[PDB]
Design a protein. Structure first.
Length: 45
């Protein structure tokens, strides 16, 4: 499934580590656990 990376802190969202929930299905207000930015600051990787 599609991995996403934080444009500020490079935190990797790997769906394998998040219950195989796709990034686009995470609640809208989900934030980067490191730098606190919103999902719109993530790029596919
Ligand atoms: Ni971040």
């Amino acid at each position: 499934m599609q991995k996403y990376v934080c444009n500020v802190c490079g935190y990797e969202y790997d769906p394998a580590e998040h219950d195989n929930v796709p990034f686009d299905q995470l609640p809208d207000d989900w934030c980067c656990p490191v730098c606190g930015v919103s999902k719109d600051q993530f790029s596919p990787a």
